Amino acid sequence: MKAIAVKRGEDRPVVIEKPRPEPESGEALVRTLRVGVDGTDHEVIAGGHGGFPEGEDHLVLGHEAVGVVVDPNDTELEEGDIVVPTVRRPPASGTNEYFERDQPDMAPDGMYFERGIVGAHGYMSEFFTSPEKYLVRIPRSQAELGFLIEPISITEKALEHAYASRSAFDWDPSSAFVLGNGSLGLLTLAMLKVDDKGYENLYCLGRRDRPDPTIDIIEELDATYVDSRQTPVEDVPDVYEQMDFIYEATGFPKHAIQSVQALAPNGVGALLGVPSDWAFEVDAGAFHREMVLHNKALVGSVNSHVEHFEAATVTFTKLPKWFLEDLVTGVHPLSEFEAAFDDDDTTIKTAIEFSTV
Amino acid sequence: MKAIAVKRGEDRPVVIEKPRPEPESGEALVRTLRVGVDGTDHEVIAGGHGGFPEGEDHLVLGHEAVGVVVDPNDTELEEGDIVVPTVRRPPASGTNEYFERDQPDMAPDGMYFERGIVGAHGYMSEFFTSPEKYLVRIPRSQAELGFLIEPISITEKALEHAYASRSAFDWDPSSAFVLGNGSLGLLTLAMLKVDDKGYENLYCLGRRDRPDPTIDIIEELDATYVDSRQTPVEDVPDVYEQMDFIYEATGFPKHAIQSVQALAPNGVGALLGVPSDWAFEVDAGAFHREMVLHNKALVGSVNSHVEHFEAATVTFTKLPKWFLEDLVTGVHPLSEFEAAFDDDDTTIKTAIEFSTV
Numbered sequence: 001m002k003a004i005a006v007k008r009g010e011d012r013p014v015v016i017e018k019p020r021p022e023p024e025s026g027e028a029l030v031r032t033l034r035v036g037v038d039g040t041d042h043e044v045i046a047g048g049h050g051g052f053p054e055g056e057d058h059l060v061l062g063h064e065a066v067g068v069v070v071d072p073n074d075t076e077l078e079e080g081d082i083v084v085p086t087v088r089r090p091p092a093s094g095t096n097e098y099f100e101r102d103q104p105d106m107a108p109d110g111m112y113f114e115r116g117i118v119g120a121h122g123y124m125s126e127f128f129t130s131p132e133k134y135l136v137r138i139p140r141s142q143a144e145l146g147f148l149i150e151p152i153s154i155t156e157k158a159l160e161h162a163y164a165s166r167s168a169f170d171w172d173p174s175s176a177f178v179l180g181n182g183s184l185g186l187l188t189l190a191m192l193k194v195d196d197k198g199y200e201n202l203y204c205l206g207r208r209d210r211p212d213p214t215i216d217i218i219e220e221l222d223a224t225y226v227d228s229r230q231t232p233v234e235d236v237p238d239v240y241e242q243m244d245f246i247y248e249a250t251g252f253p254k255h256a257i258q259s260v261q262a263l264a265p266n267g268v269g270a271l272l273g274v275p276s277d278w279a280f281e282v283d284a285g286a287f288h289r290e291m292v293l294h295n296k297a298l299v300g301s302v303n304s305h306v307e308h309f310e311a312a313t314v315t316f317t318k319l320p321k322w323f324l325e326d327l328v329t330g331v332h333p334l335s336e337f338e339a340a341f342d343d344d345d346t347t348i349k350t351a352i353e354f355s356t357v
Numbered sequence: 358m359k360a361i362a363v364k365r366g367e368d369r370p371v372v373i374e375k376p377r378p379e380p381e382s383g384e385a386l387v388r389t390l391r392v393g394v395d396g397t398d399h400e401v402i403a404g405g406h407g408g409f410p411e412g413e414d415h416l417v418l419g420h421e422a423v424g425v426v427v428d429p430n431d432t433e434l435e436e437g438d439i440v441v442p443t444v445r446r447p448p449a450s451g452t453n454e455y456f457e458r459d460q461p462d463m464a465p466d467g468m469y470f471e472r473g474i475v476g477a478h479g480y481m482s483e484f485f486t487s488p489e490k491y492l493v494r495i496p497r498s499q500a501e502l503g504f505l506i507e508p509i510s511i512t513e514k515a516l517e518h519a520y521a522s523r524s525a526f527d528w529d530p531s532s533a534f535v536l537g538n539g540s541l542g543l544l545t546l547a548m549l550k551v552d553d554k555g556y557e558n559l560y561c562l563g564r565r566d567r568p569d570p571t572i573d574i575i576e577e578l579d580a581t582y583v584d585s586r587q588t589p590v591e592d593v594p595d596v597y598e599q600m601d602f603i604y605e606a607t608g609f610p611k612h613a614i615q616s617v618q619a620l621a622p623n624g625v626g627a628l629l630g631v632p633s634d635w636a637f638e639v640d641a642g643a644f645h646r647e648m649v650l651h652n653k654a655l656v657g658s659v660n661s662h663v664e665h666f667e668a669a670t671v672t673f674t675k676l677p678k679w680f681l682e683d684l685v686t687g688v689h690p691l692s693e694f695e696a697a698f699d700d701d702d703t704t705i706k707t708a709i710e711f712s713t714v
């Protein structure tokens with residue numbers, strides 16, 4: 001079978017061949033339909049070759065997959081089922097409490113593999129296998145954009161934990177502010193528009209010049225574009241209003257600190273960004289006091305699990321068609337896959353199509 | 358009646374006289390039994406005279422009161438009821454959503470008064486009044502140490518919010534680390550010992566040399582004393598273990614930052630400290646990434662309300678007698694009240710006795 005991979009010492013994704021996998025007990029064989037490209041794929045391609053599987057020359061890319069079950073094997077799935085795989089699998093040493101308790105998304109460093117990211121091949125091959133417990137059935141009509149279910153699920157989990165932080169009181173948020181205009185930020189912005197919390201005012205932070213398709217999406221969702229070069233996060237309460245909810249998706253460390261200042265009393269920041277170490281001058285006293293005197297929270301979140309993938313299917317149905325059309329800037333056949341790894345301002349979410357149903 | 362107050366331009370608490378208050382509709386008249394002294398009382402005495410009531414020459418001190426109802430007026434309380442007052446009352450402009458929804462503890466700055474702290478006289482007078490809704494009945498045998506109910510309630514709320522942050526998954530903490538060996542830290546340490554979470558290992562951070570009565574309390578509770586001069590917060594995972602729960606009660610801004618590093622994956626820090634602005638070099642990138650990759654939370658908490666005072670009475674019953682004996686270093690009759698404002702290492706929790714039942 002064909003697969004798209006990064007090889008050791010190389011700086012580009014390429015087509016390789018490897019045998020079609022065979023499902024072990026409790027696993028189904030899946031024919032890959034479409035796989036989304038993400039920042040993490042770009043990070044692997046950049047020179048992050050520490051994530052390769054034990055004793056292997058390459059890493060198959062892609063962790064945002066949708067496929068069709070072609071061999072249900074000894075599982076309870078049926079042939080023809082449209083499924084999305086979860087990302088996390090047990091590490092080398094085998095299972096642990098996180099996997100046993102059906103919460104591998106809460107497993108710490110070294111206690112999981114992530115397919116297409118660290119320790120395990122991804123989904124950008126014509127076929128893959130997975131335990132039935134990690135295959136989430138989705139509605140058949142979500143096959144076309146099914147590669148979106150995984151990133152939606154990231155937000156489903158983050159919101160679940162952030163909202164849990166506020167559950168000891170009657171929290172009544174009216175404003176939400178997404179930091180970041182990548183596909184995650186933009187997905188989250190549309191999600192917050194359909195959120196039960198009934199947000200009145202939505203904002204999204206970026207740093208683009210017009211004309212820009214992320215600005216257009218933000219504005220078409222009836223949200224305010226906040227150009228950080230004009231109005232930084234801490235200035236936002238002056239220029240706009242205090243934000244009950246902040247969802248951080250920039251990976252900018254200053255935003256973790258400054259979100260505390262931009263928050264309304266009793267608000268929560270969800271942090272999703274993954275920055276490298278970076279030291280600079282912080283008014284920790286103001287950070288600390290503001291958290292306390294105004295009963296604020298910061299909640300970090302990573303990965304997601306089955307419940308979040310199921311929630312994502314419901315959320316998907318509520319997402320506007322125009323939005324899905326504009327968010328997905330290109331689906332590329334495997335024949336011309338290289339275009340999927342385009343990275344520029346007009347490129348929002350791409351995917352590679354391996355087959356059709 | 359007699360009261361203990363700070364007057365404008367003066368640097369010491371003194372006895373004053375003012376008329377006995379008369380209960381308005383919905384209020385009871387209370388005879389003050391005992392009032393605890395806290396750090397906030399010391400801060401008022403220091404030169405924080407911005408908290409005085411509108412157009413008044415003095416602030417009556419004390420916010421940790423226990424008393425006996427002597428006139429139930431038109432309320433549902435009975436004469437002889439032992440009660441503890443909540444601290445927060447409506448601001449000048451009158452009621453608001455926080456007060457209306459029975460959550461004034463979540464009111465932001467300027468939207469409340471705190472009796473004995475800002476905008477309203479405290480409880481260090483022979484008599485006081487309060488709405489029945491802010492008077493919490495407690496068991497009669499808690500009259501002697503009833504001034505402890507308010508600070509216990511501070512922790513009851515903080516734990517409620519911190520634990521709420523962890524409620525989206527099956528959190529199974531085994532370790533807890535209290536930062537601070539003031540009366541709040543020590544109360545919290547004994548509370549975490551009787552907490553349903555069933556903590557296996559307890560730690561408390563201080564910076565005292567032996568012999569010291571706070572060290573003795575920590576060790577007698579079967580907790581580990583962590584001298585920050587030896588093992589700072591960030592070093593604690595090396596020397597000891599990663600902490601599932603951290604309760605910050607130092608008011609040291611570095612501890613807000615460093616608690617993130619000392620936390621176990623999926624852990625939460627409660628912040629209670631109130632520092633002034635203080636800027637210094639922080640590795641914000643490491644702070645940010647650690648929050649996210651390891652699904653951690655920070656939750657700030659201030660004040661408390663009726664539900665927390667009720668919970669505090671239950672917790673009180675579970676507290677060891679030796680602990681209560683050792684925690685309360687002096688109860689001083691009003692006649693010799695000055696000793697209550699002693700502030701040294703052997704002084705833990707003091708109170709002033711205005712009357713007996």
Ligand SMILES: NC(=O)C1=CN([C@@H]2O[C@H](COP(=O)(O)OP(=O)(O)OC[C@H]3O[C@@H](n4cnc5c(N)ncnc54)[C@H](OP(=O)(O)O)[C@@H]3O)[C@@H](O)[C@H]2O)C=CC1
Binds near residue numbers: 180205208301
């Ligand atoms: N915790 C988790 O499970 C997950 C975490 N992530 C992380 O979340 C973050 C967002 O993911 P994704 O949206 O896909 O990644 P992107 O890098 O594509 O999105 C980040 C966006 O933030 C913008 N940005 C960065 N700094 C600033 C700033 N100072 N002011 C205004 N805008 C800024 C960038 O704008 P510009 O292009 O103009 O520079 C970019 O469009 C990343 O750090 C990623 O690592 C992603 C997926 C899951």
Ligand SMILES: NC(=O)C1=CN([C@@H]2O[C@H](COP(=O)(O)OP(=O)(O)OC[C@H]3O[C@@H](n4cnc5c(N)ncnc54)[C@H](OP(=O)(O)O)[C@@H]3O)[C@@H](O)[C@H]2O)C=CC1
Binds near residue numbers: 541607630660
């Ligand atoms: N949010 C809320 O509702 C409430 C907040 N507070 C706040 O919580 C904090 C604790 O209250 P309380 O216990 O009564 O106050 P204390 O000041 O009496 O307690 C703080 C303790 O922390 C210790 N400490 C300070 N810095 C360090 C450090 N670097 N290393 C080790 N120990 C340190 C001090 O030790 P030492 O004496 O040796 O210097 C002191 O014993 C205060 O900041 C207070 O303002 C208090 C009540 C309610």
Ligand SMILES: [Zn+2]
Binds near residue numbers: 151
């Ligand atoms: Zn993804």
Ligand SMILES: [Zn+2]
Binds near residue numbers: 507
């Ligand atoms: Zn108190």
